[PDB]
Structure formats: C-alpha cells, structure tokens
Nucleic acid binder design. Structure first.
Length: 134
RNA sequence: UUUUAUAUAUAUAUAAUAAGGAAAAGUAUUUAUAAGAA
C-alpha cells in the first residue's frame, strides 16, 4: 500500500512512509547486499525529512552490525545529500545549534574513526568526494 | 567529472550512478595648453 500512495506520483516521491515501514519492520536492512543496496539507496532516496534520515542512519548501522570501517562511500553520499537538501528549520540568530550541522560533524568524525580503526587493525577504504563537501 | 560493479593482469577494459536555485523597497573645482603662409 505504501508504494501506491506516494511513489506512484512521479513528480514527488515521498520515501518517509517507506523508511518508516522498514524501521518499524524487524527485518530492517539486515541481510541485504551492501553494494547494490548502497547504489540504489543513493540513487533514488533523496529529500528525506530529518527524523527519516536519522532512522536510515541507525538502520544502516544495524545493517552493517555497527562496523564503522565497512561503511561505504555511497552510504555517506546518501546521508549527506539528504541532510543537505533539508532547509534550516529556523535561522537561529547565532545559528550554531542546528541539528543537521551537528549530525554532519558526527559523520565526519565517524569517518575519522573508521580510518583509525582500519589502521589499528593493520597493527575498500572509504573516501571523501566533492559531493559531501558541496 | 567523481564513486562504485564485473572481468583481466596495485593497475587496465567495459556498465551505472551528477551534490552547485538566490528572489524585496529605500539608502562643481576636471586643471597645462603648442595654428601657419608664399
């Protein structure tokens, strides 16, 4: 029923019902191939609301069992694109307590972690792309 | 472009994928001065 109400209208594809379904569902994203799934998710899922982007973030975490190192480029790109496409809820006068900015630095620090845990394990690697900076 | 996917020997040939969209009104003194004709 979820595919019918929103996805049928080509102009505006609303993926909040879909993400909410797959977050409510116990199966979530586990047991799904990282590669095909990352490319599809990045390609199609855009303009998500903030809470949807959260649920998607933790549920990719649960897909990958919480291994920061495995977390691929396209995964970053999807989360970052959705975060950026969000407009500010309100222009706070100081304008530094935004949620999106904090989650954005959270993801960057997570990347730094993943790199450090990979190097420590030594004792493909993820990359940053112009899309994330943009 | 970039990122990944397959294949082959870190690299090569192919396929797919593209983040840059903002609206608004009103806010003088100029300077020195070079002419040709039969």
């Amino acid at each position: 029923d979820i595919l019918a109400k929103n996805l049928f209208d080509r102009s505006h594809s609303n993926w909040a019902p879909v993400i909410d379904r797959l977050y409510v569902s116990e199966k979530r994203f586990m047991d799904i191939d990282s590669r095909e799934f990352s490319v599809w998710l990045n390609g199609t899922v855009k303009y998500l609301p903030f809470h949807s982007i959260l649920h998607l973030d933790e549920m990719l975490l649960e897909q990958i069992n919480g291994d920061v190192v495995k977390f691929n480029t396209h995964m970053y790109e999807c989360i970052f694109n959705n975060l950026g496409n969000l407009k500010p809820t309100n222009f706070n006068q100081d304008g530094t307590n935004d949620k999106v900015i904090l989650k954005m630095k959270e993801l960057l620090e997570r990347y730094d972690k993943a790199l450090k845990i990979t190097e420590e394990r030594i004792n493909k690697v993820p990359k940053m792309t112009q899309a994330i900076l943009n």
